[PDB]
């Protein structure tokens, strides 16, 4: 089964406006 | 503002060639020190992380602390239309709703100037801990490109395998098997066209070949290839851009 990178690295948001 | 000149400008012509088709949009940061960038696919199995050094430029310059939002597919067209010995100069205005690239031709009677309207991204931005890994595989980066390419005829996703001696790439489909094995090389003349491995645990893995196939885009960066190996945790794929920085590529594993 393929995993996700997320299954390993925690996952910030952000936010870029332009 | 951002200012930052290439004398060898079919750097950044590569570098974004090694990305447009992995990844549509990104952020560029910008600061004093360089560029950086790091951005998942939409599928969020692999991962890229990009890094270009302040002193890699012919003459650098950040004010500010910036965060572009970039359509890669539009900075490919712009690039595109530079040709390999350009000068390439960005450039962006403290309150830039745009990033200027000009290109410079070396008889200084072409000038080229394109305007990239930048855009709005909510990214999913990752934190990548600096791990010790049991495996170092480094080789031609061309025969890399060619074991993916090939195997990825044979099967879906490609076995590595990593030993003392040296490296073996597997696949499976419907028509059979393949075993591609690289050995340690063992007279040693010029670093690049070498396979050294170096290892402390034997490591196994599986990897869509799929994916490593975008990765080897970024082949004409360098005549090397490092594989980052470590069990049960994404691969990392590295190319260094010389004396400036690297490209690296992450890949989650099959279980």
């Given at each position: 089964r393929q995993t996700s990178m997320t299954d390993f690295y925690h996952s910030k948001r952000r936010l870029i406006f332009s | 503002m951002f200012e930052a000149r290439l004398v060898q400008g079919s750097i950044l012509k590569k570098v974004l060639e090694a990305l447009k088709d992995l990844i549509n949009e990104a952020c560029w940061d910008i600061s004093s020190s360089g560029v950086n960038l790091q951005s998942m696919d939409s599928?969020?199995?692999?991962?890229?992380?990009?890094?270009?050094?302040?002193?890699?430029?012919?003459?650098?310059?950040?004010?500010?602390?910036?965060?572009?939002?970039?359509?890669?597919?539009?900075?490919?067209?712009?690039?595109?239309?530079?040709?390999?010995?350009?000068?390439?100069?960005?450039?962006?205005?403290?309150?830039?709703?745009?990033?200027?690239?000009?290109?410079?031709?070396?008889?200084?009677?072409?000038?080229?100037?394109?305007?990239?309207?930048?855009?709005?991204?909510?990214?999913?931005?990752?934190?990548?801990?600096?791990?010790?890994?049991?495996?170092?595989?480094?080789?031609?980066?061309?025969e890399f490109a060619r074991i993916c390419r090939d195997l990825s005829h044979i099967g879906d996703a490609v076995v590595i395998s990593c030993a003392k001696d040296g490296v073996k790439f597997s696949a499976s489909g419907?028509?059979?098997?393949?075993?591609?094995?690289?050995?340690?090389?063992?007279?040693?003349?010029?670093?690049?066209?070498?396979?050294?491995i170096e290892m402390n645990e034997p490591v196994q893995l599986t990897f869509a070949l799929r994916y490593l196939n975008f990765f080897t885009k970024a082949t004409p960066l360098s005549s090397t290839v490092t594989l980052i190996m470590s069990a049960d945790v994404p691969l990392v794929v590295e190319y260094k851009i010389a004396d400036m920085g690297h490209l690296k590529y992450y890949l989650a594993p099959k279980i």
């Open positions: - | 599928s969020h199995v692999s991962l890229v992380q990009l890094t270009l050094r302040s002193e890699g430029f012919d003459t650098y310059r950040c004010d500010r602390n910036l965060a572009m939002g970039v359509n890669l597919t539009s900075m490919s067209k712009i690039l595109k239309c530079a040709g390999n010995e350009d000068i390439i100069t960005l450039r962006a205005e403290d309150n830039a709703d745009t990033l200027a690239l000009v290109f410079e031709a070396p008889n200084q009677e072409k000038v080229s100037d394109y305007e990239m309207k930048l855009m709005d991204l909510d990214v999913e931005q990752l934190g990548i801990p600096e791990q010790e890994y049991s495996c170092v595989v480094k080789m031609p980066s061309g419907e028509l059979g098997n393949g075993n591609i094995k690289l050995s340690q090389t063992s007279n040693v003349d010029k670093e690049e066209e070498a396979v050294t």
